[PDB]
Every structure is written in C-alpha cells, then in structure tokens.
Coordinates of C-alpha atoms in Angstrom, one line a residue:
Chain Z
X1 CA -1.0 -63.7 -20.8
X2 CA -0.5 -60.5 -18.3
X3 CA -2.9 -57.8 -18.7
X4 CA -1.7 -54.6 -17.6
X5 CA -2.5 -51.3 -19.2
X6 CA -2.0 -48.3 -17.4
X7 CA -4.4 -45.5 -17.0
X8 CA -2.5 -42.0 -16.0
X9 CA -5.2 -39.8 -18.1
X10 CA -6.5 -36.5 -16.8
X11 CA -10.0 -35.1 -18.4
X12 CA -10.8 -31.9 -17.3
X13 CA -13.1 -28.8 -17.7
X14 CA -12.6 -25.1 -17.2
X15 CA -15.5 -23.6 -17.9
X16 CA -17.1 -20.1 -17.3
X17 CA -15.1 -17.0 -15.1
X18 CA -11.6 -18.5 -13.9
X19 CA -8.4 -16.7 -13.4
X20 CA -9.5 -13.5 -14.0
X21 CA -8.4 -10.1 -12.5
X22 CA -10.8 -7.1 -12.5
X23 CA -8.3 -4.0 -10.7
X24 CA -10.7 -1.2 -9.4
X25 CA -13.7 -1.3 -11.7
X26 CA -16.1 1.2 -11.7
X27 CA -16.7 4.7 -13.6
X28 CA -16.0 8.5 -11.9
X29 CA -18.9 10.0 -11.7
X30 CA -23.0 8.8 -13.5
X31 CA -26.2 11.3 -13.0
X32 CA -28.9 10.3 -14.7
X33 CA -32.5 13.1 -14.5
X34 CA -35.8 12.2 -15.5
X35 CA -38.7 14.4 -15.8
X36 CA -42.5 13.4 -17.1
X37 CA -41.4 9.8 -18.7
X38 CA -44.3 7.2 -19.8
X39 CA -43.4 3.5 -19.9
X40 CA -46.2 1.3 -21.5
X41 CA -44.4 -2.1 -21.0
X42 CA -41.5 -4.0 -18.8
X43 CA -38.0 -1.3 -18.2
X44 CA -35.2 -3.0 -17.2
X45 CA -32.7 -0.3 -16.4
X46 CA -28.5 -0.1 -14.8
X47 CA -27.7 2.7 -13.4
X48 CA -23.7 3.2 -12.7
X49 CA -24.1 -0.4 -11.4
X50 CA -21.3 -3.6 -12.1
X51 CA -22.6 -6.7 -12.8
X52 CA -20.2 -10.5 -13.4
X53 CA -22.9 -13.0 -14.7
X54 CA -21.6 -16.3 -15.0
X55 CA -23.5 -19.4 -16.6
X56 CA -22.3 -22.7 -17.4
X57 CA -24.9 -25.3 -18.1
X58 CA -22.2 -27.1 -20.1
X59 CA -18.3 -27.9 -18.8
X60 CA -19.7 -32.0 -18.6
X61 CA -17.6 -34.1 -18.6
X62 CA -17.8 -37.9 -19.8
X63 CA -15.6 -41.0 -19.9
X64 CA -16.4 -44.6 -20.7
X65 CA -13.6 -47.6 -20.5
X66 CA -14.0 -51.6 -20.9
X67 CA -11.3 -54.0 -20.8
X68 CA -12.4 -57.3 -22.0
Chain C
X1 CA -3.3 -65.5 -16.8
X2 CA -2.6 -62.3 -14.9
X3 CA -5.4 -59.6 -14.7
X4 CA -3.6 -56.3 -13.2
X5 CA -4.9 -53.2 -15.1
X6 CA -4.3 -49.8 -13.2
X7 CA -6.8 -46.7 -13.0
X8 CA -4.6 -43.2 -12.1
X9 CA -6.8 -41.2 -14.1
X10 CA -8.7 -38.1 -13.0
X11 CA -11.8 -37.0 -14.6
X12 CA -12.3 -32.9 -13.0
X13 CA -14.6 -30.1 -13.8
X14 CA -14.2 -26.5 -12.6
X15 CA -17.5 -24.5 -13.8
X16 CA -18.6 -21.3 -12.6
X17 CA -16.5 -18.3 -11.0
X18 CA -13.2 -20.0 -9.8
X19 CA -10.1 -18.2 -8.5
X20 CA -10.9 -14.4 -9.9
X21 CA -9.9 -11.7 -7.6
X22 CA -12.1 -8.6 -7.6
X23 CA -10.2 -5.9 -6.1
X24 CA -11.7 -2.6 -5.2
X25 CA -14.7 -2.6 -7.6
X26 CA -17.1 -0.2 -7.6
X27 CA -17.8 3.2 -9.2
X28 CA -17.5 7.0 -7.2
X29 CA -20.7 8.6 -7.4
X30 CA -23.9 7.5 -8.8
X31 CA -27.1 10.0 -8.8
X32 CA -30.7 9.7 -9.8
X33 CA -33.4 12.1 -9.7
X34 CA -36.7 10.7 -10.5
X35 CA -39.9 13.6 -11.4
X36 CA -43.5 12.4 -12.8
X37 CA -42.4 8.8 -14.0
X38 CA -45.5 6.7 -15.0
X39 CA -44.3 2.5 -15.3
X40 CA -47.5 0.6 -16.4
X41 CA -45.8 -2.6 -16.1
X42 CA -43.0 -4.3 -14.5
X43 CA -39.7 -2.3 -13.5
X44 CA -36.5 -4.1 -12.8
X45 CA -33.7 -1.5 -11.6
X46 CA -30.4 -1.6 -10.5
X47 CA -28.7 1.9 -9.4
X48 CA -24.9 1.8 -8.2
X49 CA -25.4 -2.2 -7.6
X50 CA -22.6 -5.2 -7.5
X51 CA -23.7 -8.3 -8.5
X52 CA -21.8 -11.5 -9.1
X53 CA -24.2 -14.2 -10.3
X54 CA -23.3 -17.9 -11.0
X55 CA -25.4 -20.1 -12.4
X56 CA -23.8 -23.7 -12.9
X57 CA -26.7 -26.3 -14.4
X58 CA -23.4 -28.0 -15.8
X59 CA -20.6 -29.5 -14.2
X60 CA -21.3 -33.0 -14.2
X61 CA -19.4 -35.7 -14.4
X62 CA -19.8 -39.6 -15.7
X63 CA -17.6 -42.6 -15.4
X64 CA -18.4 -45.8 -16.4
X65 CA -15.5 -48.5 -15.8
X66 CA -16.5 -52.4 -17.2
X67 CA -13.7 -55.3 -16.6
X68 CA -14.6 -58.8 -18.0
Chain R
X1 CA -5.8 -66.7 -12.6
X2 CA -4.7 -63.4 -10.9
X3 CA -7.5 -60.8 -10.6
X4 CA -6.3 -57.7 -9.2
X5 CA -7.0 -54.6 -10.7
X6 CA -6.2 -51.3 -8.9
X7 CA -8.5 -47.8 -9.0
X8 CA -7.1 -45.2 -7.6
X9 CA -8.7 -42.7 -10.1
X10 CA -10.5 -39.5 -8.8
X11 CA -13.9 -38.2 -9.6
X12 CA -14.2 -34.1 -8.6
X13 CA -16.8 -31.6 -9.2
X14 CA -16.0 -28.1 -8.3
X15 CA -19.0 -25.9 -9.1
X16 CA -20.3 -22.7 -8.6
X17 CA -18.1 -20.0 -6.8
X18 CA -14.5 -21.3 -5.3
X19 CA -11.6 -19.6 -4.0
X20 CA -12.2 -15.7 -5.4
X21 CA -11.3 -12.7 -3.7
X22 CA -13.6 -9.8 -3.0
X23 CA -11.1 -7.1 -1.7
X24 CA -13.4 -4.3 -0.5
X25 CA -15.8 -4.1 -3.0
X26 CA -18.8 -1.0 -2.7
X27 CA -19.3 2.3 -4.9
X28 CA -18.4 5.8 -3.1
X29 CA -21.7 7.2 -3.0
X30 CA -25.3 6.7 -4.7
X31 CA -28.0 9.1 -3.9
X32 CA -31.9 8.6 -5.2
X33 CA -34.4 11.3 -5.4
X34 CA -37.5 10.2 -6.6
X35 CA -41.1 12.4 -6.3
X36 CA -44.8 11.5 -7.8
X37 CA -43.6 8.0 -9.3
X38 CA -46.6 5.7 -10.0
X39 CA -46.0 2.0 -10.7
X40 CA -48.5 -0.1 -11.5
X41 CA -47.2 -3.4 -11.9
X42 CA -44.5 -5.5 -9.9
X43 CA -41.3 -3.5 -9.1
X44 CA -37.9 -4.8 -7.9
X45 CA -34.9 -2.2 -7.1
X46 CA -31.4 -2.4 -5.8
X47 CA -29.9 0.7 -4.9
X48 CA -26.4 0.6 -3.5
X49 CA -26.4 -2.9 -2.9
X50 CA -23.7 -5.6 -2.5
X51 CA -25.5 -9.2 -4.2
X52 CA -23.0 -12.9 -4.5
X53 CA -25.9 -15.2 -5.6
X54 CA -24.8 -18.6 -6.3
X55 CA -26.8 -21.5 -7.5
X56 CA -25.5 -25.1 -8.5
X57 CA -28.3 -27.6 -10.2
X58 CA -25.3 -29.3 -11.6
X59 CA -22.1 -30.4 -10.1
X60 CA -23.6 -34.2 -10.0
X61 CA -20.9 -37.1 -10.1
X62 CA -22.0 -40.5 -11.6
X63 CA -19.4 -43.5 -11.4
X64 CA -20.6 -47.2 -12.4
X65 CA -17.8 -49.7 -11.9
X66 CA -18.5 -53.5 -12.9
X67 CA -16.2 -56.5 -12.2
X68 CA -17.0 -59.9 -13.5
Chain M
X1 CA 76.2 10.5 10.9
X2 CA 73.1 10.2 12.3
X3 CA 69.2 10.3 11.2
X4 CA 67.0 13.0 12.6
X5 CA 62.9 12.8 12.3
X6 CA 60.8 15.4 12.9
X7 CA 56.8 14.6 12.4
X8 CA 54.7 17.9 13.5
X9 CA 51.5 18.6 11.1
X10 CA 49.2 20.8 12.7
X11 CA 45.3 20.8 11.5
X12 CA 43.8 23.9 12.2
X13 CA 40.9 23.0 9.8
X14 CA 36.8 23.6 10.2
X15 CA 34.6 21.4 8.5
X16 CA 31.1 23.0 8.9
X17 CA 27.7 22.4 7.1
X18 CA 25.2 24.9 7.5
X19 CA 22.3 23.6 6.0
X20 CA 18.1 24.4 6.7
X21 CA 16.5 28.1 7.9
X22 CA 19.0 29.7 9.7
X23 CA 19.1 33.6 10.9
X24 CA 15.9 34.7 9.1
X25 CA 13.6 37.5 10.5
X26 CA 9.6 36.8 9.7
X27 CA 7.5 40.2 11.1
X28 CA 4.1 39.7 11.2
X29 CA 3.8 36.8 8.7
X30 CA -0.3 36.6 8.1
X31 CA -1.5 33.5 6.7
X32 CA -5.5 34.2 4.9
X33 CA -8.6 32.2 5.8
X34 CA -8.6 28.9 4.8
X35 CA -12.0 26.8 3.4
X36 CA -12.2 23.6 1.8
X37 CA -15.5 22.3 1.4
X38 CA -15.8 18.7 0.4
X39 CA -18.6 16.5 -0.8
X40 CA -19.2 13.3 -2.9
X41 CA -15.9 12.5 -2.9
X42 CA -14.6 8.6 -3.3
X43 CA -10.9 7.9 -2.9
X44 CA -9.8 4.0 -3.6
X45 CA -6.0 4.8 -2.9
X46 CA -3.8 5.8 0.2
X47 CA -4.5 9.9 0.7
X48 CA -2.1 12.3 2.2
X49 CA -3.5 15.8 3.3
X50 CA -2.5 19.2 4.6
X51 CA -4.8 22.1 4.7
X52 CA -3.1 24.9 7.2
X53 CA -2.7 28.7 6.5
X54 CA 0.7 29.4 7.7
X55 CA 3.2 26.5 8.0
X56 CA 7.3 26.8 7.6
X57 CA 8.6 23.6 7.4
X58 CA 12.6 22.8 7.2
X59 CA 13.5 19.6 5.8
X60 CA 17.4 18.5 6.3
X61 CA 18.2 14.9 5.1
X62 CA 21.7 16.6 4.4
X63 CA 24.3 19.0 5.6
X64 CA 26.4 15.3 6.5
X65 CA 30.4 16.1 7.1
X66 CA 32.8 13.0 6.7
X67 CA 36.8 13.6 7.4
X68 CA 39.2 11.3 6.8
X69 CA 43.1 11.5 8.1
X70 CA 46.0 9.2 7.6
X71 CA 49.3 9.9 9.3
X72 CA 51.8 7.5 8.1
X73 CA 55.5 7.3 9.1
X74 CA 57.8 4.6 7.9
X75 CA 61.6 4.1 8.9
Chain Q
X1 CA 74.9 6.4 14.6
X2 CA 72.1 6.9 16.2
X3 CA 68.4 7.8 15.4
X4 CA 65.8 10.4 16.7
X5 CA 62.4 10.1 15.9
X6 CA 59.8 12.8 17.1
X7 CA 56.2 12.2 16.1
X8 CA 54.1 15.0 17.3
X9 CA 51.0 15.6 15.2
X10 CA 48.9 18.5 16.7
X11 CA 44.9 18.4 15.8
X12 CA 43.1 21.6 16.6
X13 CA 40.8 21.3 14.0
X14 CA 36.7 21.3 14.1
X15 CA 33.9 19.1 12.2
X16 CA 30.6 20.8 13.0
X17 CA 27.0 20.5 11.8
X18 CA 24.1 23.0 11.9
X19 CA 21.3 21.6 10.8
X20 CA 17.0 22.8 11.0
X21 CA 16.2 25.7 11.7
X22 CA 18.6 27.9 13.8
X23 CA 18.7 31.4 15.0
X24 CA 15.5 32.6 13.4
X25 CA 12.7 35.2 14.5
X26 CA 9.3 34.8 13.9
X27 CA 7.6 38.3 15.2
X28 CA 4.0 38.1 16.1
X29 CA 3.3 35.1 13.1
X30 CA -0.7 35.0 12.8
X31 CA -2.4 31.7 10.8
X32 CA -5.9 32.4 9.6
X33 CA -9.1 31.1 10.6
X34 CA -9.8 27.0 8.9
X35 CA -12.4 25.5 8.0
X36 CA -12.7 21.9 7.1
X37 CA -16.5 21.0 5.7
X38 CA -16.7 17.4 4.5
X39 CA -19.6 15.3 3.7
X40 CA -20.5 12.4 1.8
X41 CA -16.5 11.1 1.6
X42 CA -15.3 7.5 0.9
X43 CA -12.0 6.1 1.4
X44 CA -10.8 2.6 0.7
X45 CA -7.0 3.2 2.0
X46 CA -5.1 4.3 4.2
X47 CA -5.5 8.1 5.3
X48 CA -3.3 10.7 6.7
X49 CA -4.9 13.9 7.6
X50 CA -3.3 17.3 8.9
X51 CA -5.3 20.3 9.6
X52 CA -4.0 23.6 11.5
X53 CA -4.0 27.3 11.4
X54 CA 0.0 27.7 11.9
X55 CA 2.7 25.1 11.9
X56 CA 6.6 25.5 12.5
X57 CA 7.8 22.0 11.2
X58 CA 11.5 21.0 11.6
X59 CA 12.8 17.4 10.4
X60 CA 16.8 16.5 10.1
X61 CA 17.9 13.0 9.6
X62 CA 21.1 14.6 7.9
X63 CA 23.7 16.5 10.3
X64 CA 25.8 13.7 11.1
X65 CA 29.6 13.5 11.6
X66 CA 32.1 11.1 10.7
X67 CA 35.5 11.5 12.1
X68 CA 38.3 8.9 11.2
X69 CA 42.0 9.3 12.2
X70 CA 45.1 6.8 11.7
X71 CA 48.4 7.3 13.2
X72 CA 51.1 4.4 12.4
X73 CA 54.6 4.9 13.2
X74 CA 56.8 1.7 12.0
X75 CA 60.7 1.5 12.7
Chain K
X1 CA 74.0 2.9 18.8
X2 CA 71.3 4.2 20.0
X3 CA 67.7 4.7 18.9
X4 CA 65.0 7.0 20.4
X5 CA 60.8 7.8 19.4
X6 CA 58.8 10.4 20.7
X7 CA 55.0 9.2 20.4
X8 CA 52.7 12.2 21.2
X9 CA 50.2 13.2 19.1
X10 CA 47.7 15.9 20.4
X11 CA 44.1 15.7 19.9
X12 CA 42.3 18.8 20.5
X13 CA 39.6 18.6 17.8
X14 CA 36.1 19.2 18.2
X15 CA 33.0 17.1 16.7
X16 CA 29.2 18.5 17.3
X17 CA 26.4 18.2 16.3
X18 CA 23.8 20.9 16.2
X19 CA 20.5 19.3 14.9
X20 CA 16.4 20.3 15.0
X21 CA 15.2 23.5 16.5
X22 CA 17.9 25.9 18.3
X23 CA 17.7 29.1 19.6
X24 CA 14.5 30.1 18.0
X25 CA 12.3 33.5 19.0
X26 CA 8.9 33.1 18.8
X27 CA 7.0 36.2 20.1
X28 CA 3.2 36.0 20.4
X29 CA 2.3 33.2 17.7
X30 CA -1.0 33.3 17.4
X31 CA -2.8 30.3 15.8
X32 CA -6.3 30.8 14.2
X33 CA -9.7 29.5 15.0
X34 CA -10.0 25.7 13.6
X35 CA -13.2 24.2 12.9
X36 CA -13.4 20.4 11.3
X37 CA -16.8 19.2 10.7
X38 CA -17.5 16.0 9.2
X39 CA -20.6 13.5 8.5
X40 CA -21.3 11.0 6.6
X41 CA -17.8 9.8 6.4
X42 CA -16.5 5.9 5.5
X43 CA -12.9 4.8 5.9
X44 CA -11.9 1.1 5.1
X45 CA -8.4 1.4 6.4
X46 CA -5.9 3.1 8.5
X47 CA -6.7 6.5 9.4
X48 CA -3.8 9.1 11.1
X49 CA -5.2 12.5 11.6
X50 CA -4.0 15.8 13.6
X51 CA -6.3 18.9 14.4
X52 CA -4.6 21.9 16.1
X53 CA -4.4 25.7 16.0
X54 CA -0.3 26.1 16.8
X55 CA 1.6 23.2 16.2
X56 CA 5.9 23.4 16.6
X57 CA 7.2 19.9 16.1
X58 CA 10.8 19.0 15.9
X59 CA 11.9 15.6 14.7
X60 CA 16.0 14.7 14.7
X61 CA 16.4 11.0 13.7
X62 CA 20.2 12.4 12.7
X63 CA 22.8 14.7 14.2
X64 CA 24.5 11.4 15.0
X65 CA 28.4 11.6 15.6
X66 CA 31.3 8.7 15.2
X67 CA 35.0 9.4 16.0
X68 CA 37.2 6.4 15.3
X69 CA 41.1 6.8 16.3
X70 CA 43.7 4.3 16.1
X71 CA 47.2 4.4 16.5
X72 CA 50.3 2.0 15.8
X73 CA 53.9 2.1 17.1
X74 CA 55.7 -1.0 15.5
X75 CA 59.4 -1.3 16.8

C-alpha cells in the first residue's frame, strides 16, 4: 500500500472593491441655498461630496480534509 | 505501508478595498449658503467631503486537516 | 510503516485596505456660509475633508491539524 | 590620335531661405489694457498661460537649405 | 597617343539662411497697463505662467545648412 | 605614350547662417505697468512662471551648418 495523494488546490476570495480605476471623479461646479427650512426629525445630507463605502462581512472561506 | 500524502494547497481571502487606484478625485467648486435653518434632531452632513470606508467583519478563513 | 506527510500549504488573510493608490485626491474649492442656524440635537459635519477609515473585525485564520 | 579632357563646371548658384519677420516697419504699435480677473477656479490638468498686451513672436522651425553635388569623371 | 586630362571644377556658389526676425523697426511700440487678479485657484499639474505688458519673442530651431560635395576622378 | 591629369578644383562657396534676432531697431519700447496679485492659491505640481513689463528673448537651438567634401583621384 503507498498513500500518496497530492494536494495542489487553491481556494480563494475576492470580495468587495478590487481592481478598480476611478480617473478624476468629481462634478464642475454644486451650490446649494437655503432660506427659512424646518426639519422635525434626523437630515442626513451630501453636498458635492465623493464617497467609496466598502463592506464585506462575507468573502469566508472554509476547507475541511481527512485522509483515513 | 507507506503514508506520504502532500499539502500544496492555498486557501486566500482578499476582502475589502484591494489594489484600486483613485486618481485625482474630487469635484471643482462646492458652495453652501445656509439662512434661518431650524434642525430639531440630529444632522449628519457632508459638504465637498472624500471618504473611503472599509468595513471587513468577513475575511476569515478555516482549515481543518485530520490524518489517521 | 513510513509516516511522512508533508504541509506546505498556506493560510492568508488579506483584509481591509491593501495596496491602492490615492494620487492627489481633494476638491478645488468649498465655501460655507451659514447665519441664524439652530440645532437642537447632536450634529456631525465634514466640510472639505479628506476621511480613509478602515476597520477589520474579521480577517481571523483558524487551522486545526491532527496526526494519529 | 590622342584623347583630350576638359572638366570645367562653374556653380554660380545661391541657395537662400528667407524665412520669419523680416524688413517690416511697426509705428506706434499700442497694445489696450489688459484684465483678467480669476476666482474659484480648479484645474486637474497641466495649464499653459499667456496674458500680455502686445507681444510679436516669430517662430522658425524651417527655412532649412540642403545641397547636394556629385562630380563624377571616368576614363 | 597620349592623354590629357584637366579637371577644374570652379564653385562660386552660396547656401545662405535668414531665419527670425531680421531687419525690422519697431517705432515707439507701447504695451498697455496688466492686471492679473486671482483668487481662490487650484491646480493639480504642472503650471506654466507668462504675464507681461510687451514681448518681442524670436525662436529658430530651423535655419540650418547642409552642404555635400563629391569629386572622383578615375583613370 | 604618355598620360597627364590636372586635379584642381576651386572652392569658393559660401555657407552661413543667419539665425534669431539681427539688426533690429527698437526706438523707445515702452512696457506698461504690471500688477499680479494673488491669494489663496494651491499648486500640487511644478510651477514655471515669468512677470515682466518688456521682455525681448531670442532662442536659436538651429542655424547649425555641415560642409562635407571629399575627393578621389584613382590612377
């Protein structure tokens, strides 16, 4: 009996921003006036600004091996 | 008998922002003019901002190797 | 009996933000005028700001190995 | 019998270029007022600029002369 | 029988360049008053700025010569 | 029998060059007032700037002159 089996495998994740190219982003010109506004409850406002948001609560990776 | 299995393998996780190039972001003019603005509750703002945000609960990685 | 098994396997994490490029990021100009704002709650503002917030929970690497 | 050669060109030739401003008469040339008034401005590329209010400018990448001669005589 | 040969070629000739600005009057030339106002300005590459009231500007990377001659006399 | 050459070629021949700026008249040139104000100014590269009234600039990477001659007598 000879017990050799050979393993070369790759298991891999890319997950979320990779890679990417963003060239000069970003509008010309933003003005925004405000005169005698009322806000009761929570604003969330952007204003000519540039966000990336990146979440990866996933990407995991998981391998299991029994030789017996 | 002759026991002489071989592990190669790679188990890899990229997660998140990886390798992106950014180049010159950002827009030319950003203007606010704020008159007699009431905000009862909370204000969250941004006004010609960048953000890059990465958030990476995930990634992980498991092996489990058993020889008997 | 021969018991030699070989591991040369690799377990990587690579989480959060890796090898980008942030060529001269930043918007022209902002300007903010603001008169006879009233806020009552919690405020937060960025104006004109530059913000790379990374945050990694994850990324963890588990590897069990059992010989018998 | 005998062979006689005679071999006398003569080159009386000009080659000339003339090539740019040349001989002009400028009498009392008057360039105006210049204003440039800038503001909020955002350039993410290479700028070239000139403001002036009288130039002349004479660009010549020409006006090159090449002459080639061969004499050849064979006998 | 014998042979003459005379070889006698005669250059006189001329290979000239006049290249720019040559010869010219400029009589009493007046640039205006400038004004450069900038504020609030951004650049992100590379800038070249001029700014003048009068400019005489003269560039020539032409106006070269190139003479060859050859002569071969073979008997 | 006998043989006899007469070599002489005459070079007389003019090359020149006359290249930039050359025998200009400028009488009274009178550059302007020059103001250049600036705040609030951000550059992230290379900057090359020039403020003057009365600028003349000449600039000659040309005019350049090459005379090749060759001669062969071959008995």
């Amino acid at each position: 009996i000879v017990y050799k089996p050979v393993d070369l495998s790759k298991v891999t994740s890319k997950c979320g921003s990779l890679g990417n190219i963003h060239h000069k982003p970003g509008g010309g010109q933003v003005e925004v006036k405000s005169e005698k506004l009322d806000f009761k409850d929570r604003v969330q406002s952007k204003i000519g600004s540039l966000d990336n948001i990146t979440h990866v609560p996933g990407g995991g990776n998981k391998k299991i091996e029994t030789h017996k």
